[PDB]
PDB file of C-alpha atoms in Angstrom:
ATOM      1  CA  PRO A   1     136.726 102.974  67.084  1.00 29.07           C
ATOM      2  CA  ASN A   2     138.306 102.131  63.738  1.00 28.69           C
ATOM      3  CA  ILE A   3     135.113 100.705  62.226  1.00 28.95           C
ATOM      4  CA  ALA A   4     133.859 104.279  62.627  1.00 27.40           C
ATOM      5  CA  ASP A   5     136.770 105.707  60.656  1.00 25.78           C
ATOM      6  CA  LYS A   6     136.593 102.678  58.378  1.00 27.33           C
ATOM      7  CA  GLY A   7     132.852 102.558  57.787  1.00 27.64           C
ATOM      8  CA  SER A   8     130.179  99.869  57.591  1.00 26.37           C
ATOM      9  CA  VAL A   9     127.557  99.024  54.965  1.00 26.20           C
ATOM     10  CA  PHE A  10     125.088  98.236  57.766  1.00 25.85           C
ATOM     11  CA  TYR A  11     125.653 101.406  59.782  1.00 26.45           C
ATOM     12  CA  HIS A  12     126.919 104.968  59.392  1.00 27.08           C
ATOM     13  CA  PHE A  13     128.777 106.801  62.168  1.00 28.58           C
ATOM     14  CA  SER A  14     129.280 110.236  63.702  1.00 27.09           C
ATOM     15  CA  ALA A  15     131.545 111.333  66.551  1.00 31.39           C
ATOM     16  CA  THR A  16     130.814 114.181  68.946  1.00 29.75           C
ATOM     17  CA  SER A  17     132.416 115.764  71.997  1.00 26.51           C
ATOM     18  CA  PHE A  18     131.498 116.498  75.600  1.00 28.04           C
ATOM     19  CA  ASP A  19     133.270 117.583  78.788  1.00 25.40           C
ATOM     20  CA  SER A  20     132.613 116.880  82.464  1.00 26.07           C
ATOM     21  CA  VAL A  21     131.545 119.837  84.612  1.00 27.25           C
ATOM     22  CA  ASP A  22     134.868 119.909  86.503  1.00 26.11           C
ATOM     23  CA  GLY A  23     136.395 120.116  83.042  1.00 27.26           C
ATOM     24  CA  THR A  24     139.085 117.490  83.624  1.00 30.08           C
ATOM     25  CA  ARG A  25     137.411 114.653  81.733  1.00 29.16           C
ATOM     26  CA  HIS A  26     136.738 114.757  78.008  1.00 31.71           C
ATOM     27  CA  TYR A  27     134.349 112.446  76.198  1.00 32.58           C
ATOM     28  CA  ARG A  28     134.162 111.114  72.684  1.00 33.22           C
ATOM     29  CA  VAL A  29     130.733 109.733  71.804  1.00 31.70           C
ATOM     30  CA  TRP A  30     130.198 107.630  68.684  1.00 32.46           C
ATOM     31  CA  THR A  31     126.642 107.279  67.444  1.00 36.06           C
ATOM     32  CA  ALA A  32     126.041 104.329  65.101  1.00 40.45           C
ATOM     33  CA  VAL A  33     122.798 104.442  63.093  1.00 38.46           C
ATOM     34  CA  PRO A  34     121.559 101.370  61.185  1.00 39.95           C
ATOM     35  CA  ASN A  35     121.647 101.815  57.400  1.00 36.71           C
ATOM     36  CA  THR A  36     118.362  99.930  57.276  1.00 30.94           C
ATOM     37  CA  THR A  37     115.071 101.758  57.735  1.00 32.13           C
ATOM     38  CA  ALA A  38     113.809 102.255  61.291  1.00 32.00           C
ATOM     39  CA  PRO A  39     110.573 100.566  62.454  1.00 31.94           C
ATOM     40  CA  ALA A  40     107.508 102.803  62.842  1.00 34.46           C
ATOM     41  CA  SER A  41     107.967 102.975  66.615  1.00 33.69           C
ATOM     42  CA  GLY A  42     111.604 103.885  65.985  1.00 36.65           C
ATOM     43  CA  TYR A  43     115.068 102.358  66.378  1.00 39.21           C
ATOM     44  CA  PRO A  44     115.703 100.851  69.796  1.00 38.19           C
ATOM     45  CA  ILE A  45     118.813 102.418  71.373  1.00 40.79           C
ATOM     46  CA  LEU A  46     121.694 101.160  73.515  1.00 43.05           C
ATOM     47  CA  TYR A  47     124.029 103.481  75.403  1.00 42.44           C
ATOM     48  CA  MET A  48     127.316 101.751  76.101  1.00 44.13           C
ATOM     49  CA  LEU A  49     130.220 102.546  78.416  1.00 44.89           C
ATOM     50  CA  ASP A  50     133.928 102.127  77.660  1.00 46.20           C
ATOM     51  CA  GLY A  51     133.063 103.512  74.212  1.00 47.83           C
ATOM     52  CA  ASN A  52     136.575 103.396  72.733  1.00 45.47           C
ATOM     53  CA  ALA A  53     136.789  99.692  73.560  1.00 47.00           C
ATOM     54  CA  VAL A  54     133.354  98.837  72.144  1.00 48.27           C
ATOM     55  CA  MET A  55     134.108 100.783  68.941  1.00 48.47           C
ATOM     56  CA  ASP A  56     137.490  99.090  68.519  1.00 50.69           C
ATOM     57  CA  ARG A  57     135.887  95.642  68.704  1.00 46.75           C
ATOM     58  CA  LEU A  58     132.678  96.303  66.810  1.00 46.96           C
ATOM     59  CA  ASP A  59     132.629  94.059  63.712  1.00 45.29           C
ATOM     60  CA  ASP A  60     130.373  93.693  60.653  1.00 47.86           C
ATOM     61  CA  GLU A  61     129.343  90.084  61.317  1.00 49.25           C
ATOM     62  CA  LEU A  62     127.598  91.456  64.407  1.00 47.54           C
ATOM     63  CA  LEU A  63     126.161  94.465  62.598  1.00 51.73           C
ATOM     64  CA  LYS A  64     124.820  92.105  59.918  1.00 53.65           C
ATOM     65  CA  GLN A  65     123.278  89.892  62.602  1.00 52.49           C
ATOM     66  CA  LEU A  66     121.634  92.826  64.360  1.00 51.31           C
ATOM     67  CA  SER A  67     120.296  93.807  60.959  1.00 51.45           C
ATOM     68  CA  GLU A  68     118.584  90.422  60.707  1.00 50.42           C
ATOM     69  CA  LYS A  69     116.081  91.621  63.324  1.00 47.94           C
ATOM     70  CA  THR A  70     115.533  95.188  64.570  1.00 47.90           C
ATOM     71  CA  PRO A  71     119.008  96.828  64.563  1.00 47.54           C
ATOM     72  CA  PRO A  72     119.505  99.351  67.414  1.00 45.20           C
ATOM     73  CA  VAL A  73     121.186 102.752  67.373  1.00 48.73           C
ATOM     74  CA  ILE A  74     124.453 102.356  69.292  1.00 51.10           C
ATOM     75  CA  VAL A  75     125.826 105.131  71.484  1.00 49.67           C
ATOM     76  CA  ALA A  76     129.372 104.295  72.567  1.00 48.86           C
ATOM     77  CA  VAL A  77     130.253 106.813  75.253  1.00 47.17           C
ATOM     78  CA  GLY A  78     134.036 106.777  75.220  1.00 45.39           C
ATOM     79  CA  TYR A  79     136.873 109.141  76.066  1.00 43.14           C
ATOM     80  CA  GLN A  80     139.082 111.482  74.027  1.00 42.67           C
ATOM     81  CA  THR A  81     142.145 109.215  73.952  1.00 43.01           C
ATOM     82  CA  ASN A  82     143.976 106.699  71.724  1.00 41.28           C
ATOM     83  CA  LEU A  83     143.679 103.687  74.042  1.00 39.73           C
ATOM     84  CA  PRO A  84     140.534 101.494  74.240  1.00 41.06           C
ATOM     85  CA  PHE A  85     140.095 102.215  77.988  1.00 45.15           C
ATOM     86  CA  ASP A  86     140.655 105.265  80.216  1.00 48.32           C
ATOM     87  CA  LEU A  87     141.256 103.564  83.576  1.00 50.75           C
ATOM     88  CA  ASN A  88     141.202 106.719  85.701  1.00 49.50           C
ATOM     89  CA  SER A  89     138.262 108.394  83.991  1.00 51.28           C
ATOM     90  CA  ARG A  90     135.996 105.312  84.070  1.00 53.20           C
ATOM     91  CA  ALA A  91     137.159 104.407  87.592  1.00 53.53           C
ATOM     92  CA  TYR A  92     135.607 107.666  88.750  1.00 54.70           C
ATOM     93  CA  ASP A  93     132.567 108.080  86.470  1.00 52.77           C
ATOM     94  CA  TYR A  94     131.272 104.510  86.956  1.00 52.08           C
ATOM     95  CA  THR A  95     131.516 103.984  90.722  1.00 52.37           C
ATOM     96  CA  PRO A  96     128.523 104.756  92.985  1.00 52.32           C
ATOM     97  CA  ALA A  97     128.683 107.794  95.237  1.00 50.50           C
ATOM     98  CA  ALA A  98     126.610 106.146  97.989  1.00 49.59           C
ATOM     99  CA  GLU A  99     129.349 103.569  98.565  1.00 50.21           C
ATOM    100  CA  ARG A 100     142.434 107.233  93.209  1.00 51.30           C
ATOM    101  CA  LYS A 101     139.195 109.199  92.853  1.00 51.49           C
ATOM    102  CA  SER A 102     135.871 107.294  92.857  1.00 54.13           C
ATOM    103  CA  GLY A 103     132.121 107.920  93.215  1.00 55.48           C
ATOM    104  CA  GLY A 104     131.264 110.090  90.221  1.00 56.61           C
ATOM    105  CA  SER A 105     128.340 107.992  88.949  1.00 55.77           C
ATOM    106  CA  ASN A 106     125.606 110.547  89.735  1.00 59.40           C
ATOM    107  CA  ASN A 107     127.350 113.404  87.926  1.00 65.32           C
ATOM    108  CA  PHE A 108     128.226 111.149  85.004  1.00 65.29           C
ATOM    109  CA  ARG A 109     124.564 110.091  84.918  1.00 62.52           C
ATOM    110  CA  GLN A 110     123.577 113.759  84.967  1.00 61.60           C
ATOM    111  CA  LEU A 111     125.896 114.387  82.000  1.00 61.80           C
ATOM    112  CA  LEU A 112     124.624 111.281  80.201  1.00 59.59           C
ATOM    113  CA  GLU A 113     120.889 111.735  80.676  1.00 58.25           C
ATOM    114  CA  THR A 114     120.597 115.518  80.338  1.00 62.63           C
ATOM    115  CA  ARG A 115     123.317 116.354  77.838  1.00 63.64           C
ATOM    116  CA  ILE A 116     124.619 113.483  75.727  1.00 65.06           C
ATOM    117  CA  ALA A 117     121.437 111.451  75.244  1.00 65.39           C
ATOM    118  CA  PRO A 118     119.274 114.491  74.376  1.00 63.18           C
ATOM    119  CA  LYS A 119     121.875 115.594  71.845  1.00 64.72           C
ATOM    120  CA  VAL A 120     122.579 112.288  70.081  1.00 66.61           C
ATOM    121  CA  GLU A 121     118.937 111.238  69.674  1.00 69.68           C
ATOM    122  CA  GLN A 122     118.351 114.579  67.911  1.00 70.46           C
ATOM    123  CA  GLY A 123     117.006 114.246  64.395  1.00 69.71           C
ATOM    124  CA  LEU A 124     116.556 110.510  64.914  1.00 70.78           C
ATOM    125  CA  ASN A 125     113.488 108.323  65.306  1.00 70.53           C
ATOM    126  CA  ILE A 126     114.199 106.418  68.478  1.00 73.52           C
ATOM    127  CA  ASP A 127     111.878 104.115  70.384  1.00 73.44           C
ATOM    128  CA  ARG A 128     112.584 106.057  73.576  1.00 74.71           C
ATOM    129  CA  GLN A 129     110.497 103.434  75.318  1.00 75.42           C
ATOM    130  CA  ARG A 130     113.216 101.016  74.188  1.00 71.65           C
ATOM    131  CA  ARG A 131     116.307 102.685  75.653  1.00 69.84           C
ATOM    132  CA  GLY A 132     118.985 100.444  77.077  1.00 72.69           C
ATOM    133  CA  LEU A 133     122.095 100.832  79.194  1.00 74.54           C
ATOM    134  CA  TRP A 134     125.077  98.464  79.210  1.00 73.85           C
ATOM    135  CA  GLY A 135     128.207  98.418  81.347  1.00 72.94           C
ATOM    136  CA  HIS A 136     130.926  95.925  82.299  1.00 74.38           C
ATOM    137  CA  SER A 137     133.040  95.597  85.454  1.00 78.29           C
ATOM    138  CA  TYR A 138     133.036  99.141  86.925  1.00 77.58           C
ATOM    139  CA  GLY A 139     130.591  99.855  84.130  1.00 73.88           C
ATOM    140  CA  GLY A 140     128.565  97.014  85.603  1.00 74.49           C
ATOM    141  CA  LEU A 141     128.318  98.853  88.917  1.00 75.12           C
ATOM    142  CA  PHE A 142     127.179 102.031  87.146  1.00 79.09           C
ATOM    143  CA  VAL A 143     124.240 100.190  85.562  1.00 77.27           C
ATOM    144  CA  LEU A 144     123.147  98.905  88.977  1.00 73.84           C
ATOM    145  CA  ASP A 145     123.454 102.385  90.429  1.00 71.37           C
ATOM    146  CA  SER A 146     121.452 103.659  87.466  1.00 72.80           C
ATOM    147  CA  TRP A 147     118.816 100.954  87.808  1.00 71.47           C
ATOM    148  CA  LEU A 148     118.353 102.210  91.374  1.00 68.40           C
ATOM    149  CA  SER A 149     117.646 105.831  90.423  1.00 66.92           C
ATOM    150  CA  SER A 150     117.077 106.449  86.711  1.00 63.14           C
ATOM    151  CA  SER A 151     113.733 106.465  84.902  1.00 58.66           C
ATOM    152  CA  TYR A 152     115.526 107.362  81.703  1.00 57.93           C
ATOM    153  CA  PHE A 153     116.374 103.787  80.683  1.00 56.91           C
ATOM    154  CA  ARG A 154     114.132 100.755  80.295  1.00 56.79           C
ATOM    155  CA  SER A 155     116.566  97.881  79.832  1.00 58.35           C
ATOM    156  CA  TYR A 156     119.611  97.508  82.053  1.00 58.96           C
ATOM    157  CA  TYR A 157     122.545  95.210  81.347  1.00 61.27           C
ATOM    158  CA  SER A 158     125.012  94.878  84.240  1.00 60.79           C
ATOM    159  CA  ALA A 159     127.919  92.666  83.189  1.00 58.87           C
ATOM    160  CA  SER A 160     130.548  91.236  85.576  1.00 58.59           C
ATOM    161  CA  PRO A 161     129.948  94.031  88.086  1.00 58.12           C
ATOM    162  CA  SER A 162     133.125  94.299  90.161  1.00 59.94           C
ATOM    163  CA  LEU A 163     131.264  94.611  93.449  1.00 59.38           C
ATOM    164  CA  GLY A 164     133.911  92.548  95.225  1.00 61.26           C
ATOM    165  CA  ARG A 165     136.012  95.673  95.713  1.00 60.32           C
ATOM    166  CA  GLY A 166     134.442  98.182  98.067  1.00 59.38           C
ATOM    167  CA  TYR A 167     131.057  97.924  96.338  1.00 61.30           C
ATOM    168  CA  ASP A 168     129.546  94.696  97.682  1.00 61.85           C
ATOM    169  CA  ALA A 169     126.867  96.797  99.379  1.00 62.63           C
ATOM    170  CA  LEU A 170     125.552  97.935  95.991  1.00 60.98           C
ATOM    171  CA  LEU A 171     124.136  94.428  95.388  1.00 60.72           C
ATOM    172  CA  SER A 172     122.621  94.660  98.844  1.00 60.42           C
ATOM    173  CA  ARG A 173     121.057  98.061  97.983  1.00 60.26           C
ATOM    174  CA  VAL A 174     119.724  96.536  94.776  1.00 56.96           C
ATOM    175  CA  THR A 175     118.106  93.515  96.445  1.00 58.82           C
ATOM    176  CA  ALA A 176     116.745  95.963  99.028  1.00 59.70           C
ATOM    177  CA  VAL A 177     114.618  98.106  96.716  1.00 58.96           C
ATOM    178  CA  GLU A 178     111.066  99.056  97.559  1.00 57.22           C
ATOM    179  CA  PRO A 179     108.565  96.789  95.713  1.00 55.86           C
ATOM    180  CA  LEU A 180     106.538  99.807  94.545  1.00 54.80           C
ATOM    181  CA  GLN A 181     108.698 101.752  92.076  1.00 54.89           C
ATOM    182  CA  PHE A 182     110.555  98.662  90.852  1.00 54.46           C
ATOM    183  CA  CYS A 183     107.890  96.026  90.139  1.00 55.78           C
ATOM    184  CA  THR A 184     108.151  96.256  86.349  1.00 58.10           C
ATOM    185  CA  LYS A 185     111.740  97.448  85.798  1.00 59.74           C
ATOM    186  CA  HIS A 186     114.057  95.244  83.731  1.00 58.79           C
ATOM    187  CA  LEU A 187     117.479  94.141  85.048  1.00 57.72           C
ATOM    188  CA  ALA A 188     119.785  91.640  83.420  1.00 57.43           C
ATOM    189  CA  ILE A 189     122.911  90.661  85.335  1.00 56.16           C
ATOM    190  CA  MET A 190     125.573  89.011  83.200  1.00 58.12           C
ATOM    191  CA  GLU A 191     128.321  86.763  84.559  1.00 55.03           C
ATOM    192  CA  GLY A 192     130.650  83.973  83.529  1.00 57.43           C
ATOM    193  CA  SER A 193     134.073  83.163  84.953  1.00 57.54           C
ATOM    194  CA  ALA A 194     132.798  79.834  86.349  1.00 57.12           C
ATOM    195  CA  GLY A 195     129.759  82.024  95.928  1.00 56.47           C
ATOM    196  CA  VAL A 196     129.257  84.833  93.436  1.00 53.81           C
ATOM    197  CA  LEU A 197     126.754  82.660  91.577  1.00 52.14           C
ATOM    198  CA  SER A 198     124.823  82.042  94.769  1.00 51.97           C
ATOM    199  CA  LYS A 199     124.647  85.775  95.495  1.00 50.36           C
ATOM    200  CA  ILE A 200     123.375  86.491  91.997  1.00 48.62           C
ATOM    201  CA  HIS A 201     120.977  83.563  92.172  1.00 50.78           C
ATOM    202  CA  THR A 202     119.670  84.793  95.533  1.00 53.24           C
ATOM    203  CA  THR A 203     119.441  88.377  94.302  1.00 52.09           C
ATOM    204  CA  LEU A 204     117.342  87.455  91.282  1.00 53.32           C
ATOM    205  CA  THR A 205     115.308  85.157  93.511  1.00 55.36           C
ATOM    206  CA  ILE A 206     114.426  87.959  95.920  1.00 53.85           C
ATOM    207  CA  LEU A 207     113.881  90.467  93.084  1.00 54.15           C
ATOM    208  CA  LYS A 208     111.627  88.197  91.053  1.00 54.73           C
ATOM    209  CA  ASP A 209     109.852  87.515  94.334  1.00 54.13           C
ATOM    210  CA  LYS A 210     109.204  91.236  94.744  1.00 56.17           C
ATOM    211  CA  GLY A 211     107.837  91.106  91.221  1.00 52.15           C
ATOM    212  CA  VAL A 212     110.921  92.586  89.529  1.00 54.74           C
ATOM    213  CA  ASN A 213     111.757  91.505  85.968  1.00 52.56           C
ATOM    214  CA  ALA A 214     115.320  90.403  86.736  1.00 53.46           C
ATOM    215  CA  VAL A 215     117.177  87.915  84.558  1.00 49.43           C
ATOM    216  CA  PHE A 216     120.525  86.141  84.507  1.00 52.64           C
ATOM    217  CA  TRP A 217     122.794  85.587  81.522  1.00 50.46           C
ATOM    218  CA  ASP A 218     125.448  82.983  82.282  1.00 49.64           C
ATOM    219  CA  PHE A 219     128.612  82.347  80.259  1.00 52.25           C
ATOM    220  CA  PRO A 220     130.339  79.416  82.034  1.00 54.91           C
ATOM    221  CA  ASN A 221     134.104  79.692  82.472  1.00 54.19           C
ATOM    222  CA  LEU A 222     134.489  82.891  80.440  1.00 53.40           C
ATOM    223  CA  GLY A 223     137.154  85.032  82.047  1.00 54.06           C
ATOM    224  CA  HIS A 224     136.472  88.605  83.166  1.00 51.42           C
ATOM    225  CA  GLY A 225     138.161  89.785  79.983  1.00 49.33           C
ATOM    226  CA  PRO A 226     136.194  87.695  77.422  1.00 48.58           C
ATOM    227  CA  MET A 227     133.027  88.692  79.293  1.00 44.53           C
ATOM    228  CA  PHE A 228     133.349  92.271  77.939  1.00 46.08           C
ATOM    229  CA  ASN A 229     132.827  91.039  74.377  1.00 49.07           C
ATOM    230  CA  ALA A 230     130.237  88.386  75.184  1.00 50.06           C
ATOM    231  CA  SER A 231     128.020  90.693  77.215  1.00 52.64           C
ATOM    232  CA  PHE A 232     128.265  93.747  74.964  1.00 52.17           C
ATOM    233  CA  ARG A 233     127.454  91.668  71.882  1.00 53.51           C
ATOM    234  CA  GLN A 234     124.656  89.693  73.543  1.00 52.31           C
ATOM    235  CA  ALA A 235     123.067  92.824  74.977  1.00 51.72           C
ATOM    236  CA  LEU A 236     122.984  94.334  71.493  1.00 50.36           C
ATOM    237  CA  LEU A 237     121.567  91.090  70.169  1.00 48.01           C
ATOM    238  CA  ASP A 238     118.998  91.063  72.942  1.00 46.77           C
ATOM    239  CA  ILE A 239     117.913  94.660  72.482  1.00 45.22           C
ATOM    240  CA  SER A 240     117.571  94.017  68.725  1.00 45.89           C
ATOM    241  CA  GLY A 241     114.849  91.470  69.515  1.00 44.36           C
ATOM    242  CA  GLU A 242     116.776  88.207  69.655  1.00 46.00           C
TER     243      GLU A 242
END
């Protein structure tokens, strides 16, 4: 989150604090607002997990590029720490309850949607109809879990969801959704690395078949690591109208 301390000509920042209900997890949320005027409808907005990591890698070339179209307000939900990732915190907040401590997705969603989001969009013109959610790895699983129950977000970017570790059933739950309340919902799964492809292919096949607006972003041979950057930058690019 140095570009926040540093400062950009394309965006201006502000940091704020939050705590989990159990009081053992502490959050640091950075809100980045474009320095360019917001469209009539308002700035689109993207809430992003692993906030410290996103903020530490956010560069101006990207900010400039987003400014070429409709730059979004960026909400990097991180943790009060000096490292880019809080392995224990995220390991709990991002994993689905349905399927070390895990399964705190619902409570983290509660915190996110009824406390953080309401507070950070305050005094800002946001196209609330253009809200997006992005997550990678465990964060990826949280987006899927959110897609399944939230009506708060419109665009959902699940990147490299680590379902192959006690969460394989989440994909199953996702491809199982009732056609009714999901027909129009957006869902973009992002992968790279290199039958995971087949499962994703099939998933999107069944979802599109149900009438769901599911899409696949492929980044051939990109490791799990490089996928963090690729997906978080492309999602921003996408939400900005690329």
